[PDB]
Design a protein around this motif. Sequence first.
Motif, PDB file in Angstrom:
ATOM      1  N   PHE A  90       0.801  -1.135  -0.179  1.00 45.87           N
ATOM      2  CA  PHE A  90       0.057   0.147  -0.029  1.00 45.87           C
ATOM      3  C   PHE A  90       0.851   1.242   0.096  1.00 45.87           C
ATOM      4  O   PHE A  90       1.922   1.208   0.418  1.00 45.87           O
ATOM      5  CB  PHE A  90      -0.915   0.006   1.299  1.00 45.87           C
ATOM      6  CG  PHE A  90      -0.337   0.220   2.474  1.00 45.87           C
ATOM      7  CD1 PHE A  90       0.059   1.316   2.821  1.00 45.87           C
ATOM      8  CD2 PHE A  90      -0.470  -0.763   3.332  1.00 45.87           C
ATOM      9  CE1 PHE A  90       0.329   1.613   4.352  1.00 45.87           C
ATOM     10  CE2 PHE A  90       0.040  -0.706   4.793  1.00 45.87           C
ATOM     11  CZ  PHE A  90       0.282   0.781   5.165  1.00 45.87           C
ATOM     12  N   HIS A  91       0.220   2.246  -0.276  1.00 51.84           N
ATOM     13  CA  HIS A  91       0.888   3.554  -0.354  1.00 51.84           C
ATOM     14  C   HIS A  91      -0.334   4.905  -0.581  1.00 51.84           C
ATOM     15  O   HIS A  91      -1.423   4.577  -0.476  1.00 51.84           O
ATOM     16  CB  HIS A  91       1.895   3.860  -1.752  1.00 51.84           C
ATOM     17  CG  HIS A  91       0.876   3.682  -3.057  1.00 51.84           C
ATOM     18  ND1 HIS A  91       0.740   2.442  -3.541  1.00 51.84           N
ATOM     19  CD2 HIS A  91       0.320   4.670  -3.649  1.00 51.84           C
ATOM     20  CE1 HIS A  91      -0.128   2.650  -4.534  1.00 51.84           C
ATOM     21  NE2 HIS A  91      -0.425   4.102  -4.737  1.00 51.84           N
ATOM     22  N   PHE A  92       0.309   6.005  -0.540  1.00 48.52           N
ATOM     23  CA  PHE A  92      -0.749   7.011  -0.134  1.00 48.52           C
ATOM     24  C   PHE A  92      -0.364   8.068  -1.507  1.00 48.52           C
ATOM     25  O   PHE A  92       1.061   8.101  -1.935  1.00 48.52           O
ATOM     26  CB  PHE A  92      -0.617   7.873   0.853  1.00 48.52           C
ATOM     27  CG  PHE A  92      -0.920   6.771   1.976  1.00 48.52           C
ATOM     28  CD1 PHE A  92       0.087   6.037   2.836  1.00 48.52           C
ATOM     29  CD2 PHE A  92      -2.356   7.156   2.827  1.00 48.52           C
ATOM     30  CE1 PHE A  92      -0.396   5.386   3.845  1.00 48.52           C
ATOM     31  CE2 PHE A  92      -2.480   6.459   3.782  1.00 48.52           C
ATOM     32  CZ  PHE A  92      -1.713   5.430   4.367  1.00 48.52           C
ATOM     33  N   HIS A  93      -1.354   8.924  -1.686  1.00 52.71           N
ATOM     34  CA  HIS A  93      -1.156  10.176  -2.466  1.00 52.71           C
ATOM     35  C   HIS A  93      -1.730  11.349  -1.682  1.00 52.71           C
ATOM     36  O   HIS A  93      -2.653  10.986  -1.090  1.00 52.71           O
ATOM     37  CB  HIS A  93      -1.959  10.089  -3.949  1.00 52.71           C
ATOM     38  CG  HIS A  93      -1.500   8.834  -4.797  1.00 52.71           C
ATOM     39  ND1 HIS A  93      -0.619   8.981  -5.687  1.00 52.71           N
ATOM     40  CD2 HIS A  93      -2.072   7.627  -4.661  1.00 52.71           C
ATOM     41  CE1 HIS A  93      -0.484   7.834  -6.306  1.00 52.71           C
ATOM     42  NE2 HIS A  93      -1.392   6.979  -5.610  1.00 52.71           N
ATOM     43  N   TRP A  94      -1.015  12.346  -1.727  1.00 50.50           N
ATOM     44  CA  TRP A  94      -1.445  13.555  -0.618  1.00 50.50           C
ATOM     45  C   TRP A  94      -1.098  14.815  -1.347  1.00 50.50           C
ATOM     46  O   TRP A  94      -0.228  15.061  -2.202  1.00 50.50           O
ATOM     47  CB  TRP A  94      -0.893  13.386   0.711  1.00 50.50           C
ATOM     48  CG  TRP A  94       0.687  13.350   0.674  1.00 50.50           C
ATOM     49  CD1 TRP A  94       1.453  14.229   0.995  1.00 50.50           C
ATOM     50  CD2 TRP A  94       1.584  12.128   0.404  1.00 50.50           C
ATOM     51  NE1 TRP A  94       2.979  14.059   0.857  1.00 50.50           N
ATOM     52  CE2 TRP A  94       2.834  12.650   0.632  1.00 50.50           C
ATOM     53  CE3 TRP A  94       1.423  10.790   0.344  1.00 50.50           C
ATOM     54  CZ2 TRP A  94       4.039  11.807   0.585  1.00 50.50           C
ATOM     55  CZ3 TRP A  94       2.351  10.101   0.190  1.00 50.50           C
ATOM     56  CH2 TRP A  94       3.668  10.592   0.405  1.00 50.50           C
ATOM     57  N   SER A 102      -6.171  13.773  -3.084  1.00 50.78           N
ATOM     58  CA  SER A 102      -6.796  12.668  -3.238  1.00 50.78           C
ATOM     59  C   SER A 102      -6.652  12.611  -5.000  1.00 50.78           C
ATOM     60  O   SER A 102      -6.604  13.461  -5.769  1.00 50.78           O
ATOM     61  CB  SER A 102      -7.958  12.295  -3.099  1.00 50.78           C
ATOM     62  OG  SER A 102      -8.995  13.426  -3.506  1.00 50.78           O
ATOM     63  N   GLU A 103      -6.574  11.311  -5.436  1.00 53.93           N
ATOM     64  CA  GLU A 103      -6.757  11.147  -6.923  1.00 53.93           C
ATOM     65  C   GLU A 103      -8.162  10.899  -7.509  1.00 53.93           C
ATOM     66  O   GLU A 103      -8.409  11.799  -8.324  1.00 53.93           O
ATOM     67  CB  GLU A 103      -5.902   9.917  -7.206  1.00 53.93           C
ATOM     68  CG  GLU A 103      -4.534  10.200  -6.906  1.00 53.93           C
ATOM     69  CD  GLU A 103      -3.367   9.083  -7.687  1.00 53.93           C
ATOM     70  OE1 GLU A 103      -3.637   7.815  -7.637  1.00 53.93           O
ATOM     71  OE2 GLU A 103      -2.727   9.675  -8.386  1.00 53.93           O
ATOM     72  N   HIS A 104      -8.886   9.926  -7.002  1.00 46.42           N
ATOM     73  CA  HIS A 104     -10.394  10.232  -7.093  1.00 46.42           C
ATOM     74  C   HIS A 104     -10.969  11.413  -6.540  1.00 46.42           C
ATOM     75  O   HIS A 104     -10.244  11.662  -5.426  1.00 46.42           O
ATOM     76  CB  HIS A 104     -11.083   8.876  -6.668  1.00 46.42           C
ATOM     77  CG  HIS A 104     -10.545   7.565  -7.453  1.00 46.42           C
ATOM     78  ND1 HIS A 104      -9.489   6.784  -7.265  1.00 46.42           N
ATOM     79  CD2 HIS A 104     -11.093   7.099  -8.813  1.00 46.42           C
ATOM     80  CE1 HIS A 104      -9.080   5.925  -8.256  1.00 46.42           C
ATOM     81  NE2 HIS A 104     -10.253   6.051  -8.998  1.00 46.42           N
ATOM     82  N   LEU A 115      -5.320   6.625  -0.001  1.00 45.30           N
ATOM     83  CA  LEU A 115      -4.832   5.273   0.112  1.00 45.30           C
ATOM     84  C   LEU A 115      -5.191   4.266  -0.690  1.00 45.30           C
ATOM     85  O   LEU A 115      -6.348   4.027  -0.948  1.00 45.30           O
ATOM     86  CB  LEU A 115      -5.149   4.997   1.758  1.00 45.30           C
ATOM     87  CG  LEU A 115      -4.665   3.377   2.047  1.00 45.30           C
ATOM     88  CD1 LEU A 115      -3.353   3.155   2.023  1.00 45.30           C
ATOM     89  CD2 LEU A 115      -5.338   2.794   3.626  1.00 45.30           C
ATOM     90  N   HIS A 116      -4.250   3.574  -1.147  1.00 38.79           N
ATOM     91  CA  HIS A 116      -4.327   2.659  -2.202  1.00 38.79           C
ATOM     92  C   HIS A 116      -3.571   1.282  -1.844  1.00 38.79           C
ATOM     93  O   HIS A 116      -2.361   1.014  -1.537  1.00 38.79           O
ATOM     94  CB  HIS A 116      -3.449   2.871  -3.705  1.00 38.79           C
ATOM     95  CG  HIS A 116      -4.199   4.189  -4.186  1.00 38.79           C
ATOM     96  ND1 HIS A 116      -3.615   5.036  -5.312  1.00 38.79           N
ATOM     97  CD2 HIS A 116      -5.558   4.571  -4.217  1.00 38.79           C
ATOM     98  CE1 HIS A 116      -4.449   5.808  -5.589  1.00 38.79           C
ATOM     99  NE2 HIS A 116      -5.620   5.645  -5.193  1.00 38.79           N
ATOM    100  N   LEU A 117      -4.551   0.244  -1.580  1.00 39.75           N
ATOM    101  CA  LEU A 117      -3.998  -1.153  -1.062  1.00 39.75           C
ATOM    102  C   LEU A 117      -4.188  -1.888  -2.622  1.00 39.75           C
ATOM    103  O   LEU A 117      -5.221  -2.081  -2.981  1.00 39.75           O
ATOM    104  CB  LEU A 117      -4.964  -1.362  -0.059  1.00 39.75           C
ATOM    105  CG  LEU A 117      -5.011  -0.767   1.097  1.00 39.75           C
ATOM    106  CD1 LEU A 117      -6.219  -0.537   1.596  1.00 39.75           C
ATOM    107  CD2 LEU A 117      -4.169  -1.825   2.169  1.00 39.75           C
ATOM    108  N   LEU A 194      -3.554   1.885 -13.610  1.00 40.82           N
ATOM    109  CA  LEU A 194      -2.479   2.542 -12.581  1.00 40.82           C
ATOM    110  C   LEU A 194      -2.655   3.797 -12.963  1.00 40.82           C
ATOM    111  O   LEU A 194      -2.565   4.468 -14.008  1.00 40.82           O
ATOM    112  CB  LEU A 194      -1.450   1.910 -13.048  1.00 40.82           C
ATOM    113  CG  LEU A 194      -0.894   0.364 -13.079  1.00 40.82           C
ATOM    114  CD1 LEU A 194       0.627   0.298 -13.308  1.00 40.82           C
ATOM    115  CD2 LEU A 194      -1.053  -0.448 -11.737  1.00 40.82           C
ATOM    116  N   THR A 195      -2.385   4.702 -11.568  1.00 44.16           N
ATOM    117  CA  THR A 195      -2.521   6.107 -11.998  1.00 44.16           C
ATOM    118  C   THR A 195      -1.122   6.612 -12.064  1.00 44.16           C
ATOM    119  O   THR A 195      -1.022   8.065 -12.002  1.00 44.16           O
ATOM    120  CB  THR A 195      -3.347   6.632 -10.520  1.00 44.16           C
ATOM    121  OG1 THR A 195      -2.354   6.572  -9.445  1.00 44.16           O
ATOM    122  CG2 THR A 195      -4.665   6.202 -10.393  1.00 44.16           C
ATOM    123  N   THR A 196      -0.100   6.024 -12.185  1.00 42.15           N
ATOM    124  CA  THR A 196       1.352   6.561 -12.501  1.00 42.15           C
ATOM    125  C   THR A 196       1.720   5.468 -13.467  1.00 42.15           C
ATOM    126  O   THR A 196       1.302   4.500 -13.922  1.00 42.15           O
ATOM    127  CB  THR A 196       2.376   6.180 -11.173  1.00 42.15           C
ATOM    128  OG1 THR A 196       2.656   4.823 -11.077  1.00 42.15           O
ATOM    129  CG2 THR A 196       1.799   6.850  -9.983  1.00 42.15           C
TER     130      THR A 196
END
Length: 257
Positions: A90-94, A102-104, A115-117, A194-196
């Motif tokens: 897991f990781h986060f975006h902030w 957030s991404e969404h 958070l992405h699990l 994937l978002t990256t």
Amino acid sequence: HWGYGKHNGPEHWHKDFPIAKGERQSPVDIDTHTAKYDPSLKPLSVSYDQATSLRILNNGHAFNVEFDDSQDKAVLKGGPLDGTYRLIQFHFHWGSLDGQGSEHTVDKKKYAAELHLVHWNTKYGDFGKAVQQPDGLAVLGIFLKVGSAKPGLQKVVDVLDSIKTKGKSADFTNFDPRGLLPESLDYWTYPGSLTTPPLLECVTWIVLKEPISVSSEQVLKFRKLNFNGEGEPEELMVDNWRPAQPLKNRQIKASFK
Ligand SMILES: NS(=O)(=O)c1ccc2c(c1)C1=C(CCC1)[C@@H](c1ccc(O)cc1)N2
Ligand SMILES: NS(=O)(=O)c1ccc2c(c1)C1=C(CCC1)[C@H](c1ccc(O)cc1)N2
Ligand SMILES: [Zn+2]
């Protein structure tokens, strides 16, 4: 290479990853009025009691808490999914500020973090094979809002000083990811990516409706991380989120009325 700066950020990624302009890109805006309730969706089964965390890594884009995925220890099943998906990390975006990160988004609302699990479909044998398949991954997304502290996040926050810069890792055994979940498992789901980079179109997205609350102090420590390596000029690891992408020919389904 790619990143989140003016010169290498999301608007540039399509030059090296042309799927960036593809038909099932993530993240998206979740229009709550247009998502349809699908009564055929199952409850989600999140089975994390035997999870084995190993390590935490600053990869220059985020930090990942990595798991042993060599057996069915921490799995996601049910909901929209066919079969068994194993937790790998897991990781986060902030954000730089509490009003973004957030991404969404939900009716265009941005949360302070996400958070992405990340889980892979065991029928493909390994993560590298799974990302080549349209149903290879399931990512459980959880929004973070700033308010009360999240007790189960504090062990993550307190190790961040030891992985400040890109390429640093630390032992991170015996962490229980159950402590990062909200009470409700109500969700939205859609097919995405994937978002990256490499932005592969391999993800079933499961985004929980209920955010978790974290404290201002907890998210401030995320913002002290660095994108740069040791002995390089300091660039704070903030705003490591991709903006919403076009929904195109997709329907977002809701597990709840
Ligand atoms: N923000 S997200 O949850 O959408 C996300 C983004 C990138 C990722 C991952 C999760 C994990 C791997 C692929 C699946 C899950 C990794 C990767 C994939 C393939 C590859 O060749 C290189 C690295 N990258
Ligand atoms: N399509 S892409 O997003 O993968 C991409 C975008 C811009 C780039 C590059 C690749 C690469 C740079 C040097 C190595 C790789 C450079 C750059 C600019 C600014 C910067 O802060 C870092 C690197 N020009
Ligand atoms: Zn992510």
